[PDB]
Design an enzyme around this catalytic site. Structure first.
Site, mmCIF file in Angstrom:
data_model
loop_
_atom_site.group_PDB
_atom_site.id
_atom_site.type_symbol
_atom_site.label_atom_id
_atom_site.label_comp_id
_atom_site.label_asym_id
_atom_site.label_seq_id
_atom_site.Cartn_x
_atom_site.Cartn_y
_atom_site.Cartn_z
ATOM 1 N N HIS A 38 35.072 -0.288 6.438
ATOM 2 C CA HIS A 38 34.405 -0.465 7.724
ATOM 3 C C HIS A 38 33.672 -1.798 7.786
ATOM 4 O O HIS A 38 33.712 -2.485 8.812
ATOM 5 C CB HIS A 38 33.425 0.681 7.981
ATOM 6 C CG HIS A 38 34.052 2.038 7.944
ATOM 7 N ND1 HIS A 38 33.364 3.164 7.551
ATOM 8 C CD2 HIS A 38 35.305 2.449 8.252
ATOM 9 C CE1 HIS A 38 34.165 4.213 7.618
ATOM 10 N NE2 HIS A 38 35.349 3.805 8.040
ATOM 11 N N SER A 98 36.033 7.515 3.645
ATOM 12 C CA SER A 98 34.681 8.043 3.486
ATOM 13 C C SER A 98 34.680 9.428 2.853
ATOM 14 O O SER A 98 33.710 9.799 2.181
ATOM 15 C CB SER A 98 33.972 8.081 4.839
ATOM 16 O OG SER A 98 33.880 6.785 5.398
ATOM 17 N N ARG A 143 44.763 0.622 8.491
ATOM 18 C CA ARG A 143 45.018 0.121 7.146
ATOM 19 C C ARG A 143 46.319 0.673 6.571
ATOM 20 O O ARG A 143 46.468 0.779 5.351
ATOM 21 C CB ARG A 143 43.841 0.460 6.233
ATOM 22 C CG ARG A 143 43.459 1.924 6.298
ATOM 23 C CD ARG A 143 42.190 2.215 5.534
ATOM 24 N NE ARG A 143 41.875 3.640 5.560
ATOM 25 C CZ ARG A 143 40.708 4.148 5.185
ATOM 26 N NH1 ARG A 143 39.743 3.341 4.771
ATOM 27 N NH2 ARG A 143 40.501 5.457 5.238
ATOM 28 N N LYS A 195 31.906 18.577 12.244
ATOM 29 C CA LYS A 195 32.463 18.135 10.972
ATOM 30 C C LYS A 195 31.520 18.369 9.800
ATOM 31 O O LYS A 195 31.937 18.200 8.649
ATOM 32 C CB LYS A 195 32.793 16.639 11.052
ATOM 33 C CG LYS A 195 33.735 16.109 9.979
ATOM 34 C CD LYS A 195 33.944 14.608 10.135
ATOM 35 C CE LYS A 195 34.669 14.017 8.934
ATOM 36 N NZ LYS A 195 36.089 14.455 8.864
#
Lengths: 158, 158, 158, 158, 158, 158
Positions: free
Chosen positions: D17, D128, D90, D41
Site C-alpha cells: 500500500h 494484510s 499486483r 470483516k
C-alpha cells in the site's frame, strides 16, 4: 499537468479503445494516442492508415492527438515528454502479459507510471483481432468499431 | 427442438473433443460438428480430412453430423438453423478469448445461445496443438486421440 | 425432454441470475430454480423469502419453477428428476470452485450433466454479496436487482 | 481538479500500500486514504487506529490525507468531492472483486473514475491478512510493513 | 539428502493430498506431513484427530511421518530441519494466495525453497471443504478420501 | 538419484531463468539445462548459440550442464536418465500450457515427475519475448539478462 500516453497497435481502433479515450480525455489535460508501427505482427492496416482512423474517431476531443512511432516505447515516451502510460483492462485481456510490459517498462523509464483503466461494460470483450476476422468474412461490425472504421475494413476486403 | 452446433478447427480432433461430443449427443436431439477451415493458423490437416476424421470418431452416434465450413460462424449457424453454440471448458485455456468470442457472437447472432461444457477429468488438459507437436517428433499419441486420428498423424510424419 | 435445475443461494436474486433464467427458459422445456438454504454462510434472507423473491421475478415465465431445498444437491436433483445442472459464468469469479464443484458433482451424480451459461454484458459483474453490502449502507440497488428485490432489501435495512 | 480517493481496509497498512500511495502522490495534487470501517470483516485494528497507522506511514508526504469512514463508498466519495477511485493491482489481487466493484461503483457514482496502479515487484505479493497471521505466531514482519506498523503488531501479539 | 515439509490443514486429508504424498515419497528421502492446528479457521476435526487420519493414509510409506504443530510455519521448518516446502497445484487452487505464501515465506526462511507439485488428473478438483459439506449432507465420499477418512467423517455427523 | 532436467527455448536466457537454475542447483546433485531446438518458433538465436549463452550464465555452477536437443522431450529425458522435469512459475507464466504439458508428459513419461519452482520477486515478470523486442528497438536490456546475453543482443541488433 499530466500528459498521458496511450500506446497500442490500433489495428483497427475499436469502440472499446474509444471508450477508454473518452474517459482519458475527461481525466487528463492532454491525451496522446501513440499508434505503434509494429511491422513484425503484420498489421492489416498500415501505420499511416491506422493514424488516420484514430484521428477520425477522436476528432471531437480537443486535448487528444494521434501520432505514429516506430521506436521503443520507453524512448518514445521520453521524446513525447509524457509521464503516464495508459493501458486498458477488461474481463478479457492479457493479465499476464500486461504486468510484464508495465513492470519492464518501469525499469527502462522509471519516471513514467503505468496506470490502467477499464472500459464500459458494453464495449468490453471487443478485440481488434476478432473484428478483422469478422470483417474478412463479410460480417457486420457496426457494434465494435466506429462507422469510419467499418468503411475502411469493408473497403479493405474488396 | 434443440440443434446444437459445435464449431472448431479440430486439427486434429482429440479425446477432449470426443468426450464433449458424447455428452452433447446425450443432451440434444441433433449435434452438428462444424469444422472450420481456418487457413490463417496453418492447419496440419485439410478441411476434407478433418471432416472425415470427425465422422470416423462419431460414426457410432446417430444424432451427430459433421460439416465443413469456410464462412463466418454467425452466418453458417443461421444456414444450419442451429440455435445453440457449444464450446469446451478445461483448465483455464483462453478464458478471455472464450468470453470475447461468445459475447461478440451474441452481437452477430443474438438468437443463437452460447453455452459451455466441461469434459471429464480424464480428457481435460488435452490440446490439439500439443498433439501435433508430439506427433511431429514421433511421439506416442494413442492415449490422447482416437485410433483413427493416430493413423492419420502417423501417416503425416512418415 | 430437458429439465434443467439451476441451484444457488440467491441471497438475493440479481439481474445476473434473472438474465440466466431468461436464457434457460428459452432453451429447455422446464427450468427448476433450486434455492439452497446454506445456513453456514449466514444468508441475509430466509429460505422462504428467497423462494418468494425468485417466484416474483420469474412469475412471467411459464416453464420456470422455484423450489427450496436444504439437502444435498446430488440427492435433490435426483428427486426432481432433472438431468442438467446450470451454473453462471461471468468475469472470472471462482473459476476454480466452479470446476471442482462440477467435477465432484459428476462423481455423485454422473447422469446429471453440468453445463455453464454466460449472462449478457450488461448483467455481468453483478454479485449477490455486493448487493447486500450496498443495501446495508443505504445505497441505491435499483440498477442491480429486480424491483421486488429492492423492496425486500429496503425493508431489511430500515 | 484531480483528487484521488484510496479506499481499503488497511488492517494493517503494508509496504505494498505504501508504495502505491507514494506513486499516487507523484501524480495527483491531493491523495485521500479512505480507511473503511468494515465491521463485518472483524478488523484486527479499529477504524481509529487504522487511520493513525496510515498517517504515520504517509506523514512524509504533504499532499496525503487519511480519513476514516463507515458509510457507502459511493456516498463518501461524493462527500469528499473526489473524482478518481484508486485500487491496487499486483497480478495477485482480486481481479474478480476489483472488476465487480469498479463496474458497480460506476452505477452508483458514474462521475468517479476507477483507475488502477501497480506497485513495485518487491512490494507485490504482500497481503494484510498474511501479515496478521505471521504476527500472531510471533513471526518477523519487519520486511512487509512499516516500522511503525511492526511496533503495533509486536505490541498487539506480545 | 533432502527433507521435504508438506504443510497444510488436512481437514480432512483427501486423495488429492494423498496422491501428492505418494509422488513426494518416491522423490525425496524423507517426507514430513506437517498438519497445522489453525484454530482460527474452526476445523471440523481436531489437530489430534487430523494427525491420526494422515498417519492411517500414509502408513504404507516408510519415509513419511505426520506431525502436528501450532507455531509459525517459517519457524517450524527450521525446528524440523527441513529445507524444502511442498504445496499442491492443480487446475483448482489459489494461484494468487499460493504465490504470496511462498514469496513471504522466502523472506522469513530464505534457506527453505518452495516447490510445487501437481496431483493425478483423477484426484484434482477435490477440495477438503466440499468433502465436508457433502459428508455433512450424507453424501458418498468414497471417491475423494481414504476409506478410513470416510469412517471418521461418517461418525462425525452422528 | 535426482537428476533434474530444465527444458525451455532460452531465446535468450534471462535473469528469471538464471535465478531458477541457481535455486535448482542448491537442491539437486546435477542440473541439466535442456535447450530445445524448436525450429517452428523461429528462434532469434540458433540452438548452438542458445546453449553457449546458457553455459556462460551458469559457468559458475559446477553441477550444471547445458545440452541442446531437437527430439521429443519425453524421449530426450529418457536418453538423459533424468527423473524430474523443471518448469518455472512466476504467477505470470502459462498455467494453461504448463498444466497441459505436465499432464500430457505424464502420459509419455510417467516415471519423470514434473515439479515447479518460483523465482525471486525481482526476477519475475521477465519474459524472453519482450527482451528481444526491446533489444530490437535499441533498448537497454542490461537489467533483464546476463551481461553476456546483453553483449550478444547488442551485437545482434547493432
Amino acid at each position: 499537468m499530466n500528459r498521458v500516453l496511450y500506446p497500442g497497435t490500433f489495428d483497427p481502433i475499436t469502440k472499446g479503445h474509444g471508450d477508454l479515450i473518452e474517459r482519458a480525455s475527461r481525466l487528463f489535460d492532454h491525451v496522446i494516442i501513440a499508434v505503434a508501427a509494429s511491422p513484425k505482427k503484420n498489421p492489416l492496416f498500415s501505420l499511416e492508415q491506422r493514424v488516420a482512423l484514430a484521428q477520425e474517431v477522436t476528432k471531437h476531443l480537443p486535448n487528444v492527438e494521434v501520432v505514429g512511432f516506430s521506436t521503443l516505447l520507453a524512448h518514445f515516451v521520453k521524446e513525447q515528454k509524457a509521464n503516464v502510460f495508459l493501458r486498458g483492462l477488461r474481463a478479457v485481456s492479457d493479465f499476464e502479459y500486461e504486468f510484464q510490459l508495465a513492470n519492464m517498462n518501469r525499469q527502462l523509464a522509471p519516471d513514467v507510471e503505468s496506470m490502467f483503466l477499464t472500459p464500459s461494460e458494453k464495449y468490453s470483450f471487443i478485440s481488434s483481432t476478432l473484428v478483422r476476422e469478422i470483417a474478412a468474412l463479410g460480417g457486420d461490425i457496426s457494434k465494435f468499431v466506429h462507422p469510419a472504421v467499418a468503411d475502411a475494413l469493408a473497403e479493405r476486403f474488396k
